[PDB]
Design a protein around this ligand. Structure first.
Ligand SMILES: Nc1ncnc2c1ncn2[C@@H]1O[C@H](COP(=O)(O)OP(=O)(O)OC[C@H]2O[C@@H](O)[C@H](O)[C@@H]2O)[C@@H](O)[C@H]1O
Ligand SMILES: CC(C)CCC[C@@H](C)[C@H]1CC[C@H]2[C@@H]3CC=C4C[C@@H](O)CC[C@]4(C)[C@H]3CC[C@]12C
Ligand SMILES: CC(C)CCC[C@@H](C)[C@H]1CC[C@H]2[C@@H]3CC=C4C[C@@H](O)CC[C@]4(C)[C@H]3CC[C@]12C
Ligand SMILES: CC(C)CCC[C@@H](C)[C@H]1CC[C@H]2[C@@H]3CC=C4C[C@@H](O)CC[C@]4(C)[C@H]3CC[C@]12C
Ligand SMILES: [Ca+2]
Ligand SMILES: [Ca+2]
Lengths: 1071, 34
């Protein structure tokens, strides 16, 4: 079943149009006989079902007088039927022409040539033009292309066998039947006259050149050379011809290659015409002393031995064709296993590409393939030493975006190190004029990053276009739920990163520093390199390329903040619904491994900052970044939410220095408690930092969060003591004054809870605090107890109902006093561990509960039957068994309720069936105090030994949060917090209505921030170097490079043994 | 011991390159001698 519509490319080359298949191949023609100029309409084309080949290979019989552009359009239609319109464009045209007979080759030379051809087909995605023979040098190149097709998945490289229709083995049967031949069985073993060889069954496609004649070979050399010239003119690709052995037709192919300017590669030492070309390269081109013995007589003897001409004029024409093949030394590259080696065949292929004409963009763009850079570094050194600095600077931007396209980071570092700037990048296409001023203000390198995002979204099954398609934002970047063309601009990328990483981030994209009026500043080039490195770093995080983002994280600054934003961005990209799917799991796991790899390095950089200078690191961590929405890096670490960052002791020292504030940290808890007890008698005596300095010292004392912690703990302790004295006092007939004190006190706590709800960081976070929910239960049960007392103040029954609910309150009021235990070094993680441990007691309650109610219904059955059902029956089920697991089993009370009058207590009873009571007890008590009670002990030992370090890390995160919450809370205690809320409401009414309020903020100096930036760059580099010293200090990598040196010692051992065998053969032949 | 084995394989590469340069010089002297 062939395709009904064919996507044919136009003459402009932009896109393809769907049209008819038979109208497309009406221009292609075949020839039944050699006398017809038009020949026939083409019907020997379609799909060939080869044996041992499940892929439907396209085959096409085209005329010798037909156009090569129609064959290129048929190859583009076969590529559009292969992988759609999103095709992999080739960059090399490798031709396999040579020995059609199955000649003799060395195994190591053919192994190195097949490995270099498979590496070139894997790297460049090259087009293989074969001769169509099933035997000879086309069979070994077809086996190398079949090994490259079996080795490499996804888009296979297309290999085309260019044979003749003159050799028709089933091609007359392919001409039989209506076109298109969908699923035609290509019988290569079927005998048709005068065909002698089978076709290229290992090729991905077949092209049969037709003249209508028969058993005449060499008629298609012209059409294969015209197709190689059309492939060189189509994709602007170089064409190199690989030659192995080779008969008489091989030489002419190369002549026609060297006359047209196509370079050729000859496998030297293979034999036949390639040995004659190697002898002609030894005579005419090689000036060495071992190659000095070759002359024209030895080349004429090799031409008489190899090709065997019957005539002397044919021997003179073969000698002129051998001299014409060695006439151009640039277009001839001879590769041998004894000369080049084993891993230098593909280097000779890249040297034959590199010996072309001097288009340096096409030279260096082809040089960034198969992980090799020493040819391009020597070419850049030759362009630097030649003085041609204009064309290298013209081509280095295209080489930089091509090296950033195909993930070659050594070529990225070689292009960036060769006097080039990454902020002066040009886009691939022109930028349209935007009506919005935000898109119009971006320069051309942001259009180049948007062209990289369009090339990343042009790949099929992309998560980038699914992420933009599930973003539901506008084209400017706001979430408002032309625009489709510019949807991959960098501001919308920054908004969909800042919505994904946290809430309420907006980066400072200062794009006005790229003007030339501000270009005379001494530090604006490092700032524009920092902005270009930050946008290319966010591009490399978005494509999840780890080494590219490591290099862009290296050349930029603020590495800790950018690494933590990238670690939270790759934490949250794995949890996104657009990046979740069937095939996204392995990329999400490797991207989470890259998230842990970015999580380790900034912790190590801040460890090197703590090893360098602790005071400069404390000045670093309180510096608010202007490009990170004026926030400190500890808040960025909180929105990163990584517990390994906050468990570092340098960040804990920054948190303790923010806890003590401007006061020095020599005071203990009792010294600050005595200073809060005696303010006027200790504040000139304290060591901190005429009456204005003491007033500034008192204002620095009461602005500390630890002073507000002591004031809030003393206010809650005074509440709990005065409220417990209210509960234990007898309520009178009138309203007492201490109830008015607790009413105004708890109305001030209700105003504090309304201030905590109105100025909240989200309403869902206010519910998610446990202690604010306990404050809600606290204020609600005080309003129920106040309304129950004030409904009827003279009734004693309403007073004891009010004290009976106030008992539940004063149970609740001492459970709020856990919160001031969190700043201790010992109470905190054990309290967090107790709140973790409550789930294991709840499953202990869920395991005993059915034992409890089963023995309770058995004990209430056996203790008192023949009785009716009541609430006392529920008391007989649940009350007495529950306290038997705690110690006071009530066995004398069961003797009194058992109605037995014996001396030993269960004898002489009224019933025989009552005595089983102690026996169910003997089982209930056994199980409860032996199994379950003991099991928990083993639960608590295992739960402690699992999550004690998670209790330490969540205790330190509670540390930052408290500091932040009691830096946020105003300094007055609870009784007066209503006067501070009245002063805050008067300040908000003065700011909102009168608008006379003003404030001043501390502005950081530029030289101080430059000192922090050079301190971070000196540590960043230092940590990287040490890691790189420590990464080559482990066992496994040094055993790995020792193993690679023993394998290269085997290679140098085999080269020295081959040189010693050649010296022994020269010493044997010398005498 | 893995460290000094690695240093001996690196100095074996240095003596291997010196022996290969001496064998290339002896092969060039045998080529230029006859
Ligand atoms: N493309 C071909 N396929 C099969 N047989 C061929 C081909 N071309 C020629 N022959 C016939 O096969 C015989 C073996 O050819 P060789 O002398 O080994 O090679 P050569 O004559 O140079 O063939 C030239 C062509 O063959 C392909 O290997 C290669 O594409 C080259 O263009 C020759 O006598 C020739 O008549
Ligand atoms: C329900 C939620 C808020 C839990 C808080 C517990 C307090 C507020 C509730 C739970 C159970 C309640 C008691 C249930 C039953 C009675 C008997 C009635 O004749 C007087 C009130 C009294 C004594 C209630 C007082 C308030 C009480 C103790
Ligand atoms: C597995 C364990 C935790 C089960 C929980 C025990 C519950 C269901 C039982 C154990 C003891 C019981 C109490 C014991 C006695 C009385 C006095 C009387 O006025 C009946 C209700 C009341 C107040 C019971 C209520 C329910 C009670 C609290
Ligand atoms: C299989 C499980 C239940 C264990 C077996 C234990 C059973 C068979 C035994 C253990 C203790 C026994 C009781 C011990 C003593 C007496 C008092 C006697 O005047 C009547 C029988 C009675 C009440 C027994 C009934 C059977 C009894 C409950
Ligand atoms: Ca840096
Ligand atoms: Ca609160």
């Amino acid at each position: 079943v062939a395709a009904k519509t064919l996507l044919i490319e136009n003459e402009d080359g932009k896109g393809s149009t769907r049209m008819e298949v038979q109208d497309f191949m009406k221009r292609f023609h075949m020839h039944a006989s050699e006398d017809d100029k038009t020949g026939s309409p083409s019907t020997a084309w379609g799909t060939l079902r080869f044996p041992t080949k499940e892929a439907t290979a396209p085959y096409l019989r085209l005329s010798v007088n037909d156009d090569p552009e129609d064959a290129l359009l048929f190859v583009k239609a076969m590529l559009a039927q292969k992988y759609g319109e999103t095709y992999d464009r080739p960059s090399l045209i490798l031709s396999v022409t040579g020995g059609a007979r199955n000649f003799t080759l060395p195994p190591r030379l053919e192994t190195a040539i097949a490995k270099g051809l498979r590496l070139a087909a894997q790297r460049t995605n090259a087009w293989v033009v074969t001769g169509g023979t099933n035997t000879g040098v086309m069979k070994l190149t077809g086996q190398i292309m079949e090994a490259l097709s079996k080795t490499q998945s996804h888009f296979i490289p297309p290999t085309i066998g260019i044979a003749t229709y003159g050799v028709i083995i089933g091609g007359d049967d392919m001409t039989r039947g209506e076109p298109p031949k969908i699923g035609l069985e290509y019988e290569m073993h079927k005998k048709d006259p005068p065909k002698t060889t089978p076709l290229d069954d290992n090729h991905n496609l077949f092209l049969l050149v037709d003249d209508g004649s028969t058993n005449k070979f060499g008629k298609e050399i012209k059409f294969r050379a015209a197709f190689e010239n059309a492939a060189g003119q189509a994709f602007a690709a170089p064409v190199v011809t690989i030659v192995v052995q080779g008969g008489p037709g091989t030489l002419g192919t190369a002549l026609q290659a060297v006359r047209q300017g196509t370079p050729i590669v000859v496998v030297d030492g293979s034999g036949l015409a390639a040995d004659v070309l190697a002898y002609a390269y030894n005579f005419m081109h090689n000036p060495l002393t071992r190659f000095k013995s070759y002359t024209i007589d030895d080349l004429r003897q090799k031409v008489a031995q190899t090709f065997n001409p019957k005539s002397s004029q044919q021997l003179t024409n073969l000698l002129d064709s051998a001299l014409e093949c060695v006439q151009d030394p640039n277009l001839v590259v001879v590769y041998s296993l004894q000369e080049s080696g084993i891993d230098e065949f593909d280097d000779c292929i890249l040297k034959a590409i590199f010996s072309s004409q001097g288009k340096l963009g096409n030279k260096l763009k082809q040089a960034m393939y198969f992980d090799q850079l020493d040819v391009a570094k020597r070419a850049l050194s030759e362009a630097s030493k030649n003085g041609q600095h204009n064309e290298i600077a013209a081509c280095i931007n295209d080489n930089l975006m091509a090296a950033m396209m195909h993930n070659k980071p050594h070529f990225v570092e070689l292009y960036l190190g060769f006097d080039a700037k990454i902020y002066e990048l040009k886009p691939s296409e022109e930028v349209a004029k935007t009506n919005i001023t935000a898109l119009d203000e971006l320069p051309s390198f942001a259009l180049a990053i948007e062209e990289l995002y369009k090339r990343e979204a042009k790949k099929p099954h992309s998560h980038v276009q699914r992420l933009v398609s599930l973003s539901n934002t506008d084209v400017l970047g706001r979430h408002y739920r032309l625009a489709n063309t510019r949807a991959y601009n960098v501001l919308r990328m920054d908004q969909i990163f800042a919505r994904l990483v946290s809430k309420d981030f907006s980066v400072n994209r200062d794009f006005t520093i790229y003007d030339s009026k501000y270009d005379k500043v001494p530090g604006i080039q490092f700032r524009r390199t920092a902005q270009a490195s930050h946008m290319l770093f966010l591009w490399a995080i978005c494509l999840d390329r780890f080494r590219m983002a490591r290099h862009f994280w290296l050349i930029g600054d603020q590495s800790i903040i950018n690494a933590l934003v990238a670690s939270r961005i790759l934490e949250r990209l794995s949890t996104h619904r657009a990046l979740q799917g069937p095939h996204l799991a392995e990329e999400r796991a490797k991207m989470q491994h890259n998230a842990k790899k970015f999580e380790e390095l900034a912790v190590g950089v801040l460890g090197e900052c703590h090893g360098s200078d602790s005071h400069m690191a404390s000045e670093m961590l309180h510096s608010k970044n202007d490009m990170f929405n004026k926030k400190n890096a500890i808040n960025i670490a909180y929105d990163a939410k990584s517990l390994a960052f906050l468990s570092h002791p340098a960040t804990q020292s920054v948190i303790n220095a923010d806890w003590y504030g401007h006061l020095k940290s020599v005071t203990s808890f009792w010294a600050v408690l005595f200073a809060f007890f005696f303010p006027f008698f200790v504040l000139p005596f304290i060591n901190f930092s005429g009456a204005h300095r003491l007033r500034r010292k008192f204002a620095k004392f009461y602005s500390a969060p630890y002073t507000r912690f002591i004031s809030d703990l003393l206010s809650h302790f005074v509440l709990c003591v005065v409220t417990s004295y209210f509960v234990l006092d007898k309520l009178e007939d009138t309203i007492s004054a201490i109830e008015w004190i607790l009413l105004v006190w708890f109305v001030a706590l209700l105003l504090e809870e309304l201030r905590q709800m109105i100025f909240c960081d989200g309403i869902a976070e206010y519910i998610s605090d446990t202690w604010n929910r306990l404050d809600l239960i606290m204020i609600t049960l005080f309003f129920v107890g106040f309304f129950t007392h004030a409904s009827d103040p003279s009734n004693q029954d309403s007073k004891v109902v009010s004290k009976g609910i106030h008992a539940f309150l004063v149970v609740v009021l001492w459970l709020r006093f856990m919160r001031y235990y969190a700043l201790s070094k010992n109470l905190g993680p054990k309290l967090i561990m107790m709140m973790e441990m409550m789930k294991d007691v709840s499953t202990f309650v869920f395991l005993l509960l059915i034992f409890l109610i089963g023995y309770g219904v058995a004990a209430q059955s056996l203790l008192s039957p023949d009785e009716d059902f009541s609430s006392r029956t529920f008391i007989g089920v649940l009350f007495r068994p529950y306290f038997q697991i705690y110690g006071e089993l009530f066995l004398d009370d069961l003797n009194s309720e058992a109605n037995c009058l014996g001396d030993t207590p269960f004898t002489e009873c009224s019933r025989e069936t009552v005595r089983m009571v102690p026996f169910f007890l003997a089982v209930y008590i056994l199980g409860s105090n032996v199994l379950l009670v003991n099991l928990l002990i083993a639960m608590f030992n295992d739960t402690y030994m699992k999550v004690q370090e998670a209790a330490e890390d969540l205790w330190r995160k509670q540390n930052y949060e408290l500091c932040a919450e009691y830096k946020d809370r105003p300094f007055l205690p609870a009784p007066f917090i209503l006067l501070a809320h009245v002063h805050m409401l008067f300040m908000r009414l003065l700011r909102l209505c009168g608008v006379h309020t003003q404030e001043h903020e501390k502005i950081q100096d530029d030289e101080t921030k430059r000192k922090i930036t050079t301190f971070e760059e000196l540590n960043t580099d230092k940590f990287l170097r040490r890691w790189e010293r420590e990464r080559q200090e482990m066992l496994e990598a040094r055993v790995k490079m020792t193993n690679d040196n023993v394998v290269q010692a085997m290679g140098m051992m085999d080269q020295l043994l081959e040189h010693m065998i050649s010296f022994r053969f020269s010493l044997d032949q010398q005498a």
